[PDB]
Amino acid sequence: NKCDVVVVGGGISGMAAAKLLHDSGLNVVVLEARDRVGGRTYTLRNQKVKYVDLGGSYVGPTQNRILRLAKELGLETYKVNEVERLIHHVKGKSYPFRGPFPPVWNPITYLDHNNFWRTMDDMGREIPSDAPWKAPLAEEWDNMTMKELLDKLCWTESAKQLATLFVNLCVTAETHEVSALWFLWYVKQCGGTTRIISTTNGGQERKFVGGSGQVSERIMDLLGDRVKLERPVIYIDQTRENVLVETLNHEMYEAKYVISAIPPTLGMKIHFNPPLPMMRNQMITRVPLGSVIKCIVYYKEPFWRKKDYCGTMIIDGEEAPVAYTLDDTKPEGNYAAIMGFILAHKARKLARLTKEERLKKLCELYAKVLGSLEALEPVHYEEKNWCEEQYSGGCYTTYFPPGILTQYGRVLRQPVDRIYFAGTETATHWSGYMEGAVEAGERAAREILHAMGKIPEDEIWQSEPESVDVPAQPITTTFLERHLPSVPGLLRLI
Amino acid sequence: NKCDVVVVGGGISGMAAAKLLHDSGLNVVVLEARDRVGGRTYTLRNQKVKYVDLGGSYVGPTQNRILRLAKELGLETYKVNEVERLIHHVKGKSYPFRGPFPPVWNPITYLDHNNFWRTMDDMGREIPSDAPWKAPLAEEWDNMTMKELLDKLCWTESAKQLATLFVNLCVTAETHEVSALWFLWYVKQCGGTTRIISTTNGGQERKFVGGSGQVSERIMDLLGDRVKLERPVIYIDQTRENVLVETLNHEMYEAKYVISAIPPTLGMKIHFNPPLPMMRNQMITRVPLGSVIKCIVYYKEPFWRKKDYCGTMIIDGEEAPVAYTLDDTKPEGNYAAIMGFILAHKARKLARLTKEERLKKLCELYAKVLGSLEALEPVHYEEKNWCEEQYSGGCYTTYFPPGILTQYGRVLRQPVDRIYFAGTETATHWSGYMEGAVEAGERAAREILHAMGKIPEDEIWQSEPESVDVPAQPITTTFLERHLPSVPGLLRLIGLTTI
Ligand SMILES: *Cc1cc2c(cc1C)nc1c(=O)[nH]c(=O)nc-1n2C[C@H](O)[C@H](O)[C@H](O)COP(=O)(O)OP(=O)(O)OC[C@H]1O[C@@H](n2cnc3c(N)ncnc32)[C@H](O)[C@@H]1O
Ligand SMILES: *Cc1cc2c(cc1C)nc1c(=O)[nH]c(=O)nc-1n2C[C@H](O)[C@H](O)[C@H](O)COP(=O)(O)OP(=O)(O)OC[C@H]1O[C@@H](n2cnc3c(N)ncnc32)[C@H](O)[C@@H]1O
Numbered sequence: 003n004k005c006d007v008v009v010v011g012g013g014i015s016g017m018a019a020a021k022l023l024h025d026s027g028l029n030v031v032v033l034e035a036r037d038r039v040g041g042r043t044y045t046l047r048n049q050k051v052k053y054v055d056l057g058g059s060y061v062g063p064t065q066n067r068i069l070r071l072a073k074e075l076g077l078e079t080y081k082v083n084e085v086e087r088l089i090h091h092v093k094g095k096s097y098p099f100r101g102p103f104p105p106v107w108n109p110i111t112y113l114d115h116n117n118f119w120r121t122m123d124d125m126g127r128e129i130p131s132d133a134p135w136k137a138p139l140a141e142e143w144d145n146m147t148m149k150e151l152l153d154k155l156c157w158t159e160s161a162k163q164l165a166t167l168f169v170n171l172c173v174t175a176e177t178h179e180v181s182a183l184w185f186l187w188y189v190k191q192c193g194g195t196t197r198i199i200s201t202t203n204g205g206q207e208r209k210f211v212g213g214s215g216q217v218s219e220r221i222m223d224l225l226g227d228r229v230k231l232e233r234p235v236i237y238i239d240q241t242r243e244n245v246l247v248e249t250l251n252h253e254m255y256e257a258k259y260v261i262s263a264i265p266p267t268l269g270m271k272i273h274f275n276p277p278l279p280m281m282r283n284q285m286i287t288r289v290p291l292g293s294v295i296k297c298i299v300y301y302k303e304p305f306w307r308k309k310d311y312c313g314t315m316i317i318d319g320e321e322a323p324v325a326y327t328l329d330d331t332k333p334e335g336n337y338a339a340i341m342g343f344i345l346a347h348k349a350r351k352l353a354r355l356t357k358e359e360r361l362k363k364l365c366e367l368y369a370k371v372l373g374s375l376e377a378l379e380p381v382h383y384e385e386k387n388w389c390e391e392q393y394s395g396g397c398y399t400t401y402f403p404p405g406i407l408t409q410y411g412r413v414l415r416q417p418v419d420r421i422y423f424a425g426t427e428t429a430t431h432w433s434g435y436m437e438g439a440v441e442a443g444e445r446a447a448r449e450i451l452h453a454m455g456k457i458p459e460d461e462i463w464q465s466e467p468e469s470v471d472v473p474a475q476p477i478t479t480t481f482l483e484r485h486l487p488s489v490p491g492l493l494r495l496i
Numbered sequence: 497n498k499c500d501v502v503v504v505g506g507g508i509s510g511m512a513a514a515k516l517l518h519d520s521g522l523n524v525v526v527l528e529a530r531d532r533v534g535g536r537t538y539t540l541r542n543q544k545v546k547y548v549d550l551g552g553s554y555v556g557p558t559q560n561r562i563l564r565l566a567k568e569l570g571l572e573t574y575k576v577n578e579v580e581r582l583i584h585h586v587k588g589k590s591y592p593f594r595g596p597f598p599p600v601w602n603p604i605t606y607l608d609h610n611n612f613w614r615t616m617d618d619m620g621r622e623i624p625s626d627a628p629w630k631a632p633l634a635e636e637w638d639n640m641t642m643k644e645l646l647d648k649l650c651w652t653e654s655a656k657q658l659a660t661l662f663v664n665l666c667v668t669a670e671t672h673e674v675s676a677l678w679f680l681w682y683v684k685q686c687g688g689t690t691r692i693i694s695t696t697n698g699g700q701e702r703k704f705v706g707g708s709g710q711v712s713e714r715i716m717d718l719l720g721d722r723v724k725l726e727r728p729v730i731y732i733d734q735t736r737e738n739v740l741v742e743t744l745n746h747e748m749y750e751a752k753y754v755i756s757a758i759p760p761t762l763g764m765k766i767h768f769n770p771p772l773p774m775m776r777n778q779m780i781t782r783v784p785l786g787s788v789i790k791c792i793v794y795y796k797e798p799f800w801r802k803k804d805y806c807g808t809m810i811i812d813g814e815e816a817p818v819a820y821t822l823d824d825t826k827p828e829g830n831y832a833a834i835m836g837f838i839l840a841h842k843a844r845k846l847a848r849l850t851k852e853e854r855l856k857k858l859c860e861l862y863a864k865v866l867g868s869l870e871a872l873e874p875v876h877y878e879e880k881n882w883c884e885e886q887y888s889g890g891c892y893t894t895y896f897p898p899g900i901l902t903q904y905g906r907v908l909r910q911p912v913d914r915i916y917f918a919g920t921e922t923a924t925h926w927s928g929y930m931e932g933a934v935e936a937g938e939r940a941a942r943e944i945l946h947a948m949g950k951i952p953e954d955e956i957w958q959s960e961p962e963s964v965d966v967p968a969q970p971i972t973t974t975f976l977e978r979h980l981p982s983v984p985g986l987l988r989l990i991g992l993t994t995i
């Protein structure tokens with residue numbers, strides 16, 4: 003019934019906000035639509051897998067907030083297997099390699115690839131993390147799709163196909179669906195291309211022992227009966243002295259303040275009194291989430307390691323159901339598994355198939371890329387189609403179509419009276435990730451502590467000391483990477 | 497509590513659905529979120545204006561369903577004033593003209609303008625009205641914005657700027673916001689560029705005497721207590737024998753079937769049990785409505801007519817708050833008024849101002865465009881910003897961003913168990929208009945009459961006899977219009993000749 007703060011959503015962001023406010027001595031209630039906490043994180047347990055992350059899973063260096071919060075909750079990480087060679091599958095053939103980027107041999111293709119990645123970072127350097135709409139060319143970049151940018155930038159079909167896979171994998175959307183400005187901000191706010199794509203020393207370095215679901219479950223353990231499961235919020239009334247929050251099961255919660263810790267567009271599922279201001283009313287109809295099926299095939303052994311493959315597969319072209327895989331084997335070498343993403347339009351296309359039809363297609367693909375008949379002998383399969391989730395809207399995160407970030411981006415974390423806005427979408431560092439969820443929840447919680455006079459304005463945004471367990475190594479480039487000309491550059495010299 | 501059909505939404509679509517079901521002897525309830533019917537139609541009455549349409553207003557030739565429904569309810573139409581000259585205002589100067597398109601004198605520019613409109617209509621003939629995703633190049637056209645298409649098509653800035661204003665005015669969105677496939681579908685399903693842009697012989701020919709709001713009000717009069725105002729629907733449950741529909745004021749309705757007659761994205765405001773199928777679940781997060789403020793400035797007299805201007809202004813420029821106006825004077829010649837639209841990004845930008853500051857900007861623009869100091873002497877002002885409507889999401893209608901119509905378009909009007917979809921967005925002729933609202937409402941009602949075994953499948957889709965009151969002149973071209981080359985075609989002819 004009555005409390006200091008109602009948090010809408012029991013994901014990492016809502017749970018992080020509620021823990022900070024509870025630790026500061028306020029009475030918090032978390033209203034959660036599902037029969038579970040964790041949202042876009044979900045750990046399934048069974049005897050066949052022990053545990054598997056079917057939603058968010060990976061953490062890496064520079065993600066210091068999720069690493070600190072998890073360490074405090076008693077969680078440990080292990081390294082994603084990258085001891086042996088990565089595979090680039092192009093034109094029906096496997097090319098094993100080492101290092102984060104697949105090698106390119108044709109000298110014109112080399113210049114075009116090198117220029118693509120370098121240009122993404124060059125453009126990112128002019129985009130403020132906390133205000134991408136303040137980029138000097140914000141309207142020019144916001145009014146084109148990543149498809150138009152790649153058409154201008156990529157002189158080779160080779161580079162244009164790899165850059166397309168890169169967009170699809172990063173933001174689970176087609177190049178023609180997303181703003182160039184938003185995508186370039188998205189990469190820049192994760193620390194750039196090398197950091198976002200890397201396993202070793204990047205975003206995919208590590209997983210949590212026992213699953214990422216434990217972050218939200220263990221915060222729920224701390225809060226006890228303050229977390230209300232199967233309480234979808236339907237109605238928020240800010241006309242009276244206290245804020246009133248109503249759930250679908252007809253419960254009424256009364257608070258001084260509300261944290262909205264749900265994806266922006268899921269704001270549409272709530273009736274507001276008074277109506278939302280115009281810009282937010284329209285913004286929450288304009289910000290979809292991407293489309294992905296996460297698929298884990300289990301094997302008796304990590305057989306790819308015998309051929310000096312780590313299990314990472316980068317798979318070009320339309321025919322492949324999965325464009326990208328990682329070794330999902332447990333640190334002990336047991337529960338051997340390959341994790342694959344069915345991305346964007348393929349998620350929509352292959353959703354029509356049965357679970358068994360998807361398994362056969364994945365196994366046949368992996369047999370070709372790994373060059374082993376052992377890929378045809380799976381012992382177990384798990385998958386999750388995030389497109390079908392009423393209380394997520396998709397995965398991994400919210401993308402901005404062309405024109406939306408410059409016109410509406412400012413409204414994303416603007417408070418509406420006594421509603422403050424959390425969720426990974428409102429973060430300024432690793433927005434879209436579990437790290438962003440923690441940044442946003444803690445910031446929204448501290449905006450309410452300041453509204454209450456408990457902390458000064460300069461304590462709303464707080465830096466995070468570096469993890470001792472997962473330190474970041476510097477991102478380096480070579481002299482040639484920095485100075486080799488583009489393809490049009492090599493032409494102007496001829 | 498119990499009925500045959502719950503209709504969610506008391507706009508024109510839901511009320512047309514409800515009237516048809518009621519006339520076929522079913523028990524219907526209409527659950528309307530607002531304290532009024534009409535939705536994106538709203539007629540304000542006060543002593544200063546007598547009546548004014550602040551939402552949908554115009555009807556024209558080929559909109560035979562809204563004309564028939566309106567006439568059955570006892571309503572009359574009158575013609576929007578197009579007796580005197582139209583104005584094209586470009587680069588700070590006014591160029592008066594007659595006929596639907598501003599004339600172009602520069603021959604290269606003429607070839608580019610002619611080719612622009614022609615290509616719009618040529619591409620449109622490739623696109624089936626009822627399945628735009630089946631166009632041969634659906635994918636290629638859907639992966640392009642209208643901005644990219646105009647950049648390829650328009651060899652002059654003059655044609656590009658006019659084409660930009662055309663998109664802004666048609667679908668209240670920027671060229672870079674909208675799918676080229678969707679926009680080309682949208683124009684073609686209205687009968688093509690000439691029909692959609694014309695006053696005389698087009699979409700803007702007429703208004704209802706007394707306002708368009710009377711359509712929804714008069715159907716509510718026929719239905720009595722069956723219409724429930726201030727019942728926003730929050731929850732639909734299909735797990736049991738009867739469909740359960742719950743409202744925000746805690747009332748429960750039980751029906752055999754539901755028509756959803758709300759903009760597609762406003763389906764997000766409803767919690768579904770069981771959850772929607774995947775494709776609809778995502779589709780309703782991907783289909784925003786456009787942005788528009790409708791502004792009516794009142795004057796002592798229609799002073800523009802005395803300079804032989806009908807009141808129609810087509811105004812190019814970033815600085816102009818309004819890109820399009822029509823005479824909104826009553827048919828009696830009194831309550832002299834100019835209607836203008838503040839479109840797309842300008843609706844966002846100028847919403848920051850006061851009502852009085854917007855009125856002042858509009859009067860200054862009208863003064864310059866009409867060359868008239870009288871435009872600075874308004875007697876009254878009415879405006880409505882549709883961006884702020886929780887239960888509309890915007891106006892006029894839903895647009896599709898790049899990639900969405902090919903991936904998700906097939907599920908727009910696909911039933912979900914015992915939920916059928918009405919609303920203008922599900923129409924195949926004048927989708928986005930009051931006409932499309934009637935088509936979709938009556939089609940959805942008949943889908944249910946079919947499901948109940950009351951009519952055969954061939955009666956779900958039913959054609960409409962032509963209005964005898966508003967007959968349609970056919971859309972014609974001249975030989976030159978059909979066969980003049982584009983600018984790149986002229987350059988090809990030159991390259992060939994000189995060889
Ligand atoms: C799905 C997914 C996500 C993902 C990814 C792969 C997949 C398949 N891989 C990731 C990774 O390897 N590393 C990483 O850091 N992130 C990865 N992502 C994304 C990541 O999971 C998300 O960024 C993160 O989980 C976001 O958390 P946040 O707390 O911001 O949002 P949420 O999890 O969606 O939580 C929202 C909660 O709110 C509830 N909800 C929704 N509507 C209501 C109403 N009306 N009332 C009450 N509660 C509501 C949701 O049910 C949810 O629990
Ligand atoms: C706003 C506008 C529209 C318009 C236009 C100019 C403006 C500024 N000019 C038009 C014109 O000149 N001629 C024309 O034919 N159309 C024009 N448009 C478009 C026109 O208004 C619309 O196409 C038409 O009115 C749409 O009708 P439809 O019946 O499909 O949709 P609706 O009017 O939006 O009605 C929906 C009703 O549902 C209610 N609602 C919404 N959510 C709920 C829930 N959860 N529960 C119950 N009811 C709900 C809305 O309140 C609304 O009444």
Ligand SMILES: Cc1c(C)c2ccc(OC[C@H]3CCCNC3)cc2oc1=O
Pocket residue numbers: 060102103104164167168171172198199200205206316328
């Ligand atoms: C969740 C996840 C992300 C976001 C992610 C984002 C980018 C990414 O890049 C790896 C590829 C991109 C294509 C070119 N080389 C390396 C890999 C990723 O792996 C992942 O598991």
Ligand SMILES: Cc1c(C)c2ccc(OC[C@H]3CCCNC3)cc2oc1=O
Pocket residue numbers: 554596597598658661662665666667692693694699700810820892
């Ligand atoms: C509702 C409405 C529409 C959709 C509408 C759509 C197009 C339109 O075009 C007239 C312009 C287009 C640009 C070229 N000259 C004449 C005018 C319109 O006036 C309207 O009131």
